[PDB]
Design a protein around this ligand. Structure first.
Ligand SMILES: CCCCCCCCCCCCCCCCCC(=O)O[C@@H](COC(=O)CCCCCCCCCCCCCCC)COP(=O)(O)OC[C@H](O)CO
Ligand code: NA
Ligand code: NA
Lengths: 613, 611
């Protein structure tokens, strides 16, 4: 029809990348005859895949935005706010089109190890998909206006776009009027003004992926506009990255492993293993979450794939509702810590750090979290005197292990690939996806071509949202580093640079405070760009800083009044949010304790990666 | 699966806008552009490819169905299987030739900032792959309905193995060259022509039969020449005069609205409705006025037929007379400019289109006058009654109602004749005026209707584009083998007078027009007669007008004619009565044709004086 054209085309390109990578590994490992074009071809296709994902997201209106202030507004103000955000997004898309055309015209360098092919093939992705994004925005405007959620029809946008394109193509010297330098010369306060405007527009519902672009454009307009052409290439260059390839494949691996059949087998094995100790079903839940974390890079999937079973088992065992909710909500944070992890990949991409070292560093805190949660569950259960389930016979344990053998072999594969160094994170993700597909198709007989295509489509759709923010934050970093914001901030914060512990304490406190009202995914892209240079200023190790920031932000999904884990657990378990929060409250002590422990003693985190690499 | 329709319609409106900027800048701003024509051609190539793909998907390519209508279904199974296999081979070779030609072309375009010709030449394999996919999709339904013995999976595996062999072992193809076994020699072209006639009469579409015939001839002698010959396949569509066809078709479709046609009929009835035999005069005049805009006879037959038939029946006419008049009055369309057939002839023979239009204007008027005289005589002899004469108020109201409708033919004719606009520019202006009138003046136009009209125009132009490219490919072999010189050496005895050649050609065309449709017959006949006509020092404009008239004659001849069937369908009467009523009206057409072929000066004088 006329909406699935990006999903039909994007899905086909996703399959092509999978076939190319699997051929690269087979040739190197088996035949010892490596290929020189696989990486470049994969990155070239991934650029288009990411652009198509962005188009899908902007069509479905699914871009991340802060809704804390938006949730406390009568609709009569929401109408004006939505009108403003629609205008801002339209302007951003038009400027994307202009900059993509210009940077495609400017591409000159050839691509070696690809037959001398010019770089215009890479650089042409931006305008062709920006046109589709503009079409999708115009299409969505009709639905927005018809229901009374905005003030402007799509005819207004069509007329404005036609007029703007005609002006841009027939007299581009008319746009020099709207330069702030022509009226007021702020000087060195341009960065502060741009950041203030960025915060103001971000707090009123504008998505971050456009807010960063708007802030950077305002800064450039204030000082000088001719320096934007040099910096605009980073938008295309950010997607042309090898480490960024692992995100969609890890997402697809999690999606494929999150079927009902595999989860039931894993939970049955865990229950047969840890079901008869003091605090049985709590230990069962913790163990199941730990096992799932080795193959899943997200916490919401773990929360939504096992809650209805773990909560029921705990209720049958003799557990109160608050305890069930607390354990279920607390056990979710293990996922993002144990590798693989989307948050660690994002931090490594932003800070230009090796993902493997981040994974190795973050492996230990997951084990510490698991042990602390198990100890707390045992103490609570012993205090309350809950009954003990009968011991399982050896035959049932053996049968459950035989059933779940191939399902549980995956985390071992991931850890062996990563720790031993035989594979890179992207190759590890590719191997994991191939193994999961084989297991689903031939061993469990629970997969179909339609299901595989739908999983690929979902992975691309969730990848596009991250891709837009990645490219925009890469654009924002140039503005941040050009004017030396971090150096000035450090100079202002004098007499506190004596001890790095004070800086770490302040950063942790700020992150904890901000995590109570902003979702983790948005908070990461909101706070990292201005903190990474500041951390670099104080000679703070970047691997330890990344681990600490990831843990601190993952803590924030458990604290009221805004926490996704609390809402998900309450919805799944059919219980009120207040009871879930009350049950969660006693379980926040171990996480704070381990956070303080790693903050005081960085050697715990730093020892393992140094020994291994 | 509207993937081609959605993308093709987007390109169609892009072409329309670019052409508009060309004429406006050149007229009032006096700042002509240097890239509008190049962009128009470059986009028209893709538009034609998309139309061909759509036609392949819908299985609507033209073919001869005379012998196919006289055989049992058992034979039809084998015939359809053979046709499917031949089309599959044609599409595969199409893909291969597109890839080779794209990998060969390197020349730049100086009129577009040095852009390489690869941009033009890459449109062949990209759309060829989509055509192959559409054929595979249609094969499933063909096998499901029981019309063929070959399922789709067989085609899939055959395509896979063929692609693998081509990419990894092209040298294995050296066993299918006829030069391996026997060297036919000079008679290779004759053998290829015999195979072409047979494969056409079997039921293969023309646009593929010509390709098969020329490929067989090339493989008969040397396969290394087809590499040089394959550039014409893409260069054929890269033509600016060819752009007039889709826009004229769109203009006709837009103007064929029921509201406009009702007003035109009302004005014609108020004007010429009271004379003896008034209804026939009204029918002829309305057909002439609508042919001033349209360029197809089928629109004339199917649009205004019911109202004219009802008016004639009310007046007290007979069924045979009304049917005959309605059928015979539809041939004025292709004669009066604009006309699709004249454009096709000009493209094939490389002749000016404005000269063709000017030359062909007069015979349409002669036909109209002859038909009016014949109708008047028949009505007077049969003693039909007379209608009262309308008063000045009715005629003035009709004029005020249909002013904007009758403006368009005069605008088009004035643009063509005065030399102010080229035929493509005239088509663009006509389309713009029609859409403006529809949207704002009469208020019966919607954006969805415009998109549907554009889709229909693209679908109907793809079929013509495929035949155009294939016939241009065929002409290469025809010219290389020196067929016309051999034919002249054979019929040296016929060269006594050019009148003998003309009457022989006319008789052959008249005999061939009783079984084949006008379009298929034209595409079969023109490539073989144009070089022969040039051989005998025969003028090409006069020959084109005469051939167009002779081909248009065949649509009113039994046992095959589209006009008879359409008139019978829309008139609720048997085909036999329609034929027996048409028969007395064929005399003026034959008389006009004989008069034209006797005095070519009648056709020749007007364009030379007008130029
Ligand atoms: C709608 C909002 C305004 C959109 C303005 C379009 C961007 C400006 C532009 O295109 O630049 C012109 C000049 O722009 C300026 O002088 C600066 C305009 C400031 C833009 C500020 C954006 C708004 C930020 C807040 C929202 C032309 O210079 P050029 O060399 O890029 O010309 C086109 C090129 O040669 C074709 O290849
Ligand atoms: Na994980
Ligand atoms: Na006409």
């Amino acid at each position: 029809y006329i909406n699935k054209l990006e999903e039909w085309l994007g899905g086909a390109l996703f399959i092509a990348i999978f076939g190319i990578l699997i051929a690269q590994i087979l040739s190197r490992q088996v035949f010892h005859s490596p290929l020189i074009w696989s990486e470049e071809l994969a990155k070239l296709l991934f650029v288009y895949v990411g652009m198509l994902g962005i188009s899908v997201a902007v069509r479905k209106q699914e871009h991340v935005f802060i809704d804390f202030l938006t949730n406390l507004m009568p609709e009569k103000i929401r109408k004006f706010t939505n009108t403003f955000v629609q205008l801002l997004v339209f302007i951003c898309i038009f400027l994307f089109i202009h900059f993509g055309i210009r940077t495609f015209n400017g591409a000159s360098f050839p691509i070696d190890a690809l037959g001398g092919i010019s770089e215009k093939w890479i650089f042409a992705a931006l305008p062709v998909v920006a046109i589709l994004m503009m079409f999708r925005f115009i299409q969505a405007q009709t639905l927005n206006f018809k229901t009374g959620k905005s003030y402007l029809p799509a005819t207004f946008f069509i007329i404005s776009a036609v007029i703007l394109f005609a002006i841009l193509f027939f007299a581009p010297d008319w746009f020099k009027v709207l330069r702030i330098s022509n009226y007021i010369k702020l000087g060195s306060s341009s960065v502060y003004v741009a950041l203030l405007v960025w915060l103001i527009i971000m707090f009123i519902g504008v998505p971050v992926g456009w807010s960063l672009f708007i802030a950077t454009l305002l800064y450039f307009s204030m000082t000088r506009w001719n320096v934007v052409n040099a910096a605009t290439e980073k938008l295309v260059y950010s997607l042309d990255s090898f480490p960024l390839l692992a995100v969609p494949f890890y997402i697809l691996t999690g999606i494929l492993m999150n079927t009902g059949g595999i989860t039931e087998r894993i939970f049955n094995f865990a229950k047969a293993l840890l079901g008869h100790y003091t605090g049985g079903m709590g230990h069962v839940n913790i163990g199941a979450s730990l096992l799932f974390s080795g193959m899943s890079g997200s916490a919401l999937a773990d929360a939504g794939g096992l809650g209805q079973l773990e909560i029921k088992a705990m209720r049958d065992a003799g557990y109160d509702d608050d305890i069930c909710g607390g354990i279920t909500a607390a056990s979710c944070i293990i996922g993002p810590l144990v590798p693989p992890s989307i948050a660690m990949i994002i931090y490594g991409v932003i800070a230009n750090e090796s993902i493997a070292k981040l994974f190795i560093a973050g492996f230990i805190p997951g084990v510490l979290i698991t042990l602390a949660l198990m100890a707390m569950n045992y103490r609570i259960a012993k205090k309350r005197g809950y009954p003990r389930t009968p011991k399982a016979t050896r035959e049932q344990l053996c049968s459950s292990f035989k059933q779940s053998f191939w399902a549980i072999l995956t985390p071992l594969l991931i850890i062996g690939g990563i720790f031993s160094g035989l594979f890179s994170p992207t190759e590890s993700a590719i191997v994991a996806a191939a193994y999961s597909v084989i297991i689903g198709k031939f061993v469990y007989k629970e997969l179909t071509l339609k299901s595989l295509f739908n999983s690929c489509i979902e992975a691309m759709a969730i990848t596009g949202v991250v891709a837009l923010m990645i490219m925009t934050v890469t654009f924002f970093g140039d503005m941040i580093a050009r004017e030396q914001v971090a150096m000035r901030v450090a100079d202002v914060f004098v007499a506190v640079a004596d001890s790095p512990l004070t800086v770490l304490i302040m950063i942790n406190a700020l992150l904890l405070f901000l995590g109570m009202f902003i979702d983790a995914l948005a908070l990461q892209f909101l706070v990292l760009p201005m903190l990474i240079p500041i951390a670099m200023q104080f000679n703070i190790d970047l691997i330890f800083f990344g681990v600490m920031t990831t843990l601190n932000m993952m803590v924030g999904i458990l604290t009221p009044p805004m926490g996704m884990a609390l809402f998900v657990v309450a919805r799944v378990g059919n219980m009120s949010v207040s009871t879930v929060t009350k049950g969660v409250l006693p379980f926040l002590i171990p996480v704070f304790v381990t956070l303080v422990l790693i903050t005081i003693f960085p050697q715990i985190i730093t020892f393992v990666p140094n020994l291994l690499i």
